Symmetry: D2
Subunit: 267 residues, 4 copies
């Protein structure tokens, strides 16, 4: 049990393809006791989370809702029991309106759209850490999901901007989390076919979704020295669990790349 006895809050399950679903599955297989947070369709998410290896309380969390955030630690504490604290927090949340993605012109995305995406995808990492650090044990770990935004790329558009914001937020979350003996890190994952990829990325690409996703999949697997499988979230979930474990105890404010080594190779 890599996470045996650890109490871990995992956010971001929307379907069984979600990276958070696989983080939760691997974490439960490794002995973690989970609290899950879901957004919007809690009744559908409930149905999905029933397919996880073990039962886990499901709490509603809209990161844009200040009352959900203010009552969060209290709702987590009643779910895990008084006296118990969290050892891990998984932020696997992202959003960007379709206007800030795909073939929609980069300059045409209104700031209202971009700002909502930045709020959910980047600011929410600080807001979740602010709400959960008061109930985190020393030695704990906060992990957020990133997609390497160091270079501009096709389709990802304003989400790349949101991920660059996220990386910077992570380094500041590490400064605040250090006061609690808590580490804060991002897992920069390769492309995994999720509902976000299909509905947000795919949908915003339209006529170009097929070619772009094919080129992304073939190019990523070629670039990755050990290959990359866009339909297998397990290596990403295992990396998130390594950061939640006690086996990366000196890493904070950082980014672990679970991308097959793709970011290290030009071609």
């Amino acid at each position: 049990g890599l996470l045996d006895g650890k109490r871990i809050l995992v956010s971001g399950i929307i379907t069984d393809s979600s990276i958070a679903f696989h983080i939760a599955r691997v974490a439960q297989e490794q002995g973690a006791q989970l609290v899950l947070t879901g957004f919007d369709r809690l009744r559908l998410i409930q149905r999905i989370t029933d397919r996880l290896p073990a039962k886990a309380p499901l709490l509603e969390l809209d990161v844009q809702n200040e009352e959900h955030l203010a009552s969060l630690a209290g709702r987590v504490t009643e779910a895990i029991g008084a006296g118990n604290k969290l050892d891990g927090v998984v932020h696997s949340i992202g959003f960007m309106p379709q206007t800030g993605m795909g073939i929609n012109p980069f300059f045409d995305a209104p700031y209202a759209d971009v700002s909502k995406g930045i709020h959910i995808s980047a600011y929410s990492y600080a807001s979740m850490a602010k709400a959960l650090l008061p109930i985190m044990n020393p030695g704990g770990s906060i992990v957020g999901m990133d997609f390497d935004p160091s270079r501009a790329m096709p389709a990802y558009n304003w989400m790349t901007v949101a991920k660059s914001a996220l990386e910077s937020v992570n380094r500041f979350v590490a400064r605040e989390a250090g006061k609690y003996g808590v580490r804060s890190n991002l897992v920069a994952a390769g492309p995994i076919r999720t509902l976000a990829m299909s509905a947000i990325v795919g949908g915003a690409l339209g006529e170009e979704a097929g070619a772009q996703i094919q080129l992304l999949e073939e190019g990523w697997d070629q670039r990755a020295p050990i290959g990359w499988n866009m339909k297998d979230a397990t290596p990403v979930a295992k990396t998130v669990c390594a950061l939640l474990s006690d086996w990366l105890p000196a890493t904070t404010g950082d980014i672990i790349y679970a991308d097959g080594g793709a970011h290290t190779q030009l071609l």
Copy 2:
């Protein structure tokens, strides 16, 4: 005449200490014909800009005002004359509310304040390029001001997140501007005593402002192999002019460090 006969739009002048004031001064000393944009205190900005080596048309430009941005190209064309286009555009604009700066807790900055800062400091780089690219000549150059946000640091707080988003925005503006034969780059300057430093950073640092700024100047100057004088914007102004000129014609989506070499040295 490094910028001889170039029509250059310079935004960001508020006082004679502004980085945009020194860029405007150096650019005019190099033969550039300027169009200056100012925000909020245009009567006072007219007084400051009257101190430049040559008088230049001053236009109002609030980067949050959609009408100012939509009318920008037409107002510039009216200033430079029909049939003329801009060769350079300088974005030297930044803002971050007090809550997102200094000794005020990072976690206590509301997203409304952070979003306002990201709008002005990062999104406006894309909205200014979108407004001005249709009126820019091939071979042109768009330059924005950055402050190395790759590592977290005391006091800079959410402005670091805005600069990280700005760096990502710049890489996407480079893609769009490339279609016009225009380069887009950021100049990451070392610290310079401007109104933004004293009023925004210093204001948010409270009683710890004098010591933190003195510590920053000494540290930066010690780390920089060629030294650093935060009272002198000229080295920074010259670096922006090098980017506006045809002497860096193969550089786009990039950050040029005008910081004394500080970011290349640990101690």
Copy 3:
């Protein structure tokens, strides 16, 4: 056991303070079956390895001796039993002559000395992977020890160049290892009081050794959001074991920073 049943080669032990000694100890506490390699003071190394939880075979390996490298895989197979292969390889080797370190002028290190340092510290990562890759199992992992060379610093001098070379070598060794299903990563560790730190770094600093090392420990701990203990190799050793495990299976050609997050913070 995180490394249950894995056969791992650990090079680089000279004293019980060596980072490789703690990597070997932690790997053995986690079920790894080790094969140890040592250089020059084999008798001392044998006494040192007698302090490890389990007595592992000790193999002579001077990384500048082509006979030792050409016979390495055969000697390793004699040690771990024919029919058995390595699951992991740890490179924890470094050397730089005194002229290429400390207060000795950077410009005065003769190339013969710098080349020796680069050969042991950087090229040996590729020569070790070349010898051991044919006897490594798919899923295997090669880990090297690095010290963040992205920025110049005092005293490290030509060893910073050797580490920059090593980071590049690591990225190519990942291209080669990838075809065998083997990962290749580096652990950029924070400062640890080892024999190399006192004899090589401290030795080259002269009478400035205590003050410089005291400043390094204080500065590193100050910068690390989770703190840093120069007398504690265990967090570093734990990180190397995480890379040797199946829990980072999508990371290759990469660098994981086991430095307390110090590289992500300016101050």
Copy 4:
């Protein structure tokens, strides 16, 4: 005053053919008023014919960066060429070499250290040894510029030259620490691909039958990646970037890398 490098005395090393990056650096620097001192290696009679194709006449000095005597006499020979009492305002290092075993389709692991070490000596250590030799005859406000090819990520064919470029980048950061004492800047120009003798003879030669396909993929792929396009046949943009660094217009940039690659390294 009249030219970006007016009145500056600049040493330019690395000219071998008129396609060399150093040749175009020399040409553009002379076009901007720089008085040059050129350095050449091995084929000095052939190089003298190449250096006569430049806009203005410049002295040509022999310099094998692996030769202690050429380095020890260098500042003296430069002082003789520019006149005593005059100093260099710039130094350009556009030198590189890596034996075939360390390049192309030759297996990365089979490159012997003797070969790799020669390449790192010529391509990375020499940047420090040239600075050590020329900093004592450089003026405050001076500038040392070296040539780099972005080694932050592994790539096909570049193999051990990537390792030398990584070492060079780290050397440049330390050369900045030393040059700073003299008020001199030290930077690299990470240029995009340019059709030079090194590309054809060393890279192409090491690529064997894959030379044409890899060069065509490199050429078109870089142009595509670069938001402003990239012309592998035009070294002028790179030459202008080196002159920009040798000028007084990047006065606060040291120990750094300026990318003259059309922006390609910023795009995935």
